[PDB]
Design a protein around this ligand. Structure first.
Ligand SMILES: Nc1ncnc2c1ncn2[C@@H]1O[C@H](COP(=O)(O)OP(=O)(O)O)[C@@H](O)[C@H]1O
Ligand SMILES: Nc1ncnc2c1ncn2[C@@H]1O[C@H](COP(=O)(O)OP(=O)(O)O)[C@@H](O)[C@H]1O
Ligand SMILES: [Mg+2]
Lengths: 41, 528
């Protein structure tokens, strides 16, 4: 069986653009965490 | 060489003739039904709407009525399908996605018929005999209930668990079905859906929502007034305690000494004392007002041990007269012609970080409140929006109690009635009737297409099972096979399916008759 062709790439490129936006915010505040995290001004 | 040598119109006004107007009206309508198709069925996806000028208000929704009301379209023929979608939401509250897809599939099949050199008036006259033969075969297939309580309750549970399916609430379907069916039975047959107050607030999971037994109010009590009183006697009033009764005339004070002003000032302060003493003759301990209460009468209630609740709008006073059972009172001259409310315990509760007044133990209980808890602000908005679709469709089943098997069984049922009619009528209308039966069979196709199943094989199995006798066969979306609808419990409302055919056949008739689009000169916007 080889059916179920996916002819639309919009949902794939949008789901991947949500991952990179959320992963980028988590990388921003990674430094300020724990007893030895610094401060942002 | 141009559009007539003479100039009739002004500068900026446009006209479209027959061959190009049908091109605009047919690509405008298909575009609307293509954006919305992705949100159809138990496994439909979800969209995001960002505003560019409204302070960037991010809202996330699924229903096909709030999406169309927000998308700004300039196509003349696409504005008809946005208007008809709003009327569906304001009539029955469910079926907006299905009414736009169906009316957009009828137009797609009407463009290949014009290319066969068929007059538009032939298609329209052929479709009228198709809608009539379709609504007769749906009425005959309805199951009328309501003579048994144990059967009617099971019909309302199946309807509620079918509407909540495409919505975000489908994760906790077993919990939100009981909150949606018990809140409708509290109305005791009154179609007043405003009596259900949905209070939403941040914090907590979606599984922490509940339906409160009594009532909840987001107001505050006066200073140093009792927080709790057991066995209360509530009096609901709407009277002006602001400053004093202004006594509207054109009056003024014209005394000639400053001691006479002090005597009149003491006359106002004894006017409000008399009004308060006339309230206490009822023998109450809970006064509720819909306007403000100032600092003088606030201490008079607190010295006799009376709870005063001030600033409760019409939404919170009309509801409290149906819960406890009192009446909205004024003029305070006859304590024997008034009826007081009743409760059993009134306390202050802590939901998150706010305080609300709780009403535990009630007489009637004809109105209620639902507490929604969620992680984000978009989940709270979507839970409220989805829950409103479950309450609206359960208020129609009680007035008109007859249900139609859903999940694809109803669409194939009406499509078979048109096919048997199209094999009888001679002429060109046999071609136009088949297009109507072709557009009804794509609604089950889209449902199976979103789930990734073999749609071209399931429709063939359904069409072959509906022409031999099996009138309850339909799609089974939990496995991917064909299953019965009277066993699994996929049920819809008769009024919802009836309003879809009639609305989607009129909008395809108005649009199809258009052969000339005339645009006036747009109003310009001042830049500076
Ligand atoms: N003295 C400590 N030694 C090791 N770990 C710590 C100490 N104090 C706090 N933590 C840990 O650091 C984690 C994160 O804390 P922090 O980043 O300061 O604030 P937040 O809990 O809001 O992220 C906590 O889960 C805690 O277990
Ligand atoms: N559990 C289910 N199994 C099969 N079909 C379903 C189920 N739940 C809903 N449907 C079908 O999905 C269709 C669309 O419903 P939905 O997208 O939730 O709202 P709307 O009717 O406004 O499009 C309905 O016609 C219904 O028959
Ligand atoms: Mg629905």
């Amino acid at each position: 069986g080889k059916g179920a062709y996916q002819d639309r790439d919009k949902p794939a490129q949008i789901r991947f653009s949500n991952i990179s936006a959320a992963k980028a915010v988590a990388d921003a505040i990674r430094t300020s965490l724990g007893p030895k995290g610094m401060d942002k001004m | 060489l141009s559009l007539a040598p003479v100039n009739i119109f002004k500068a900026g006004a446009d006209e479209e003739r027959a061959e190009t107007a049908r091109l605009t009206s047919f690509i405008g309508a298909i575009a609307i039904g293509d954006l919305v198709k992705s949100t159809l069925g138990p496994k439909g996806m979800d969209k995001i709407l960002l505003s560019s000028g409204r302070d960037a208000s991010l809202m996330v929704t699924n229903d096909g009525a709030t999406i169309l009301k927000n998308i700004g379209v300039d196509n003349p023929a696409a504005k008809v399908l946005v208007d008809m979608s709003r009327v569906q939401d304001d009539e029955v509250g469910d079926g907006t996605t299905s009414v736009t897809v169906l009316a957009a599939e009828l137009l797609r099949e009407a463009e290949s018929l014009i290319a066969k050199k068929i007059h538009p008036q032939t298609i329209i006259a052929g479709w009228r005999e198709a809608t009539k033969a379709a609504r007769e075969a749906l009425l005959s297939s309805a199951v009328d209930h309501g003579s048994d309580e144990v059967k009617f309750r099971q019909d309302l549970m199946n309807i509620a668990g079918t509407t909540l399916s495409s919505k975000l609430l489908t994760h906790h379907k077993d919990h939100f079905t009981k909150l949606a069916v018990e809140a409708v039975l509290r109305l005791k047959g009154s179609g007043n859906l405003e009596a259900i107050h949905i209070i939403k607030k941040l914090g907590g999971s979606l599984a922490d929502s509940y339906l409160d037994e009594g009532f909840l109010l987001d107001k505050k009590i006066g200073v140093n007034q009792p927080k709790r009183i057991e066995n209360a006697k509530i009096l609901i009033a709407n009277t002006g305690m602001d400053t004093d009764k202004i006594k509207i005339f054109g009056s003024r004070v014209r005394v000639d000494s400053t001691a006479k002003v002090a005597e009149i000032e003491h006359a106002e302060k004894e006017k409000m004392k008399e009004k308060v003493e006339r309230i206490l003759k009822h023998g109450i301990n809970c006064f509720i007002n819909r306007q403000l209460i100032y600092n003088y009468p606030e201490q008079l209630f607190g010295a006799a041990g009376v709870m005063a609740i001030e600033h409760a709008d019409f939404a919170g006073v009309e509801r409290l007269a149906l819960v406890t059972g009192g009446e909205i009172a004024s003029t305070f001259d006859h304590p024997e012609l008034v009826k007081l409310g009743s409760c059993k315990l009134i306390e202050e509760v802590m939901i998150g970080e706010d305080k609300l007044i709780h009403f535990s133990g009630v007489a009637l209980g004809e109105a209620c409140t639902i507490v929604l808890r969620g992680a984000t602000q978009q989940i709270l908005d979507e839970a409220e929006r989805s829950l409103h679709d479950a309450l609206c469709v359960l208020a129609q089943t009680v007035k008109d109690s007859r249900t139609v098997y859903g999940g694809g069984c109803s669409e194939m049922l009406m499509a078979h009635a048109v096919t048997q009619l199209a094999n009888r009528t001679p002429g060109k209308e046999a071609v136009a009737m088949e297009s109507y039966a072709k557009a009804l069979r794509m609604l089950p196709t889209i449902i199976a297409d979103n789930a990734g199943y073999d749609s071209a094989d399931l429709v063939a199995q359904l069409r072959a099972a509906h022409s031999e006798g099996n009138t309850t066969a339909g799609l089974d979306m939990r496995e991917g096979t064909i299953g019965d609808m009277a066993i699994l419990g996929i049920t819809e409302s008769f009024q919802v399916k009836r309003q879809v055919l009639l609305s989607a056949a009129e909008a395809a008739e108005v649009i199809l008759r258009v052969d000339n689009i005339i645009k006036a000169a747009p109003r310009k916007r001042v830049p500076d």
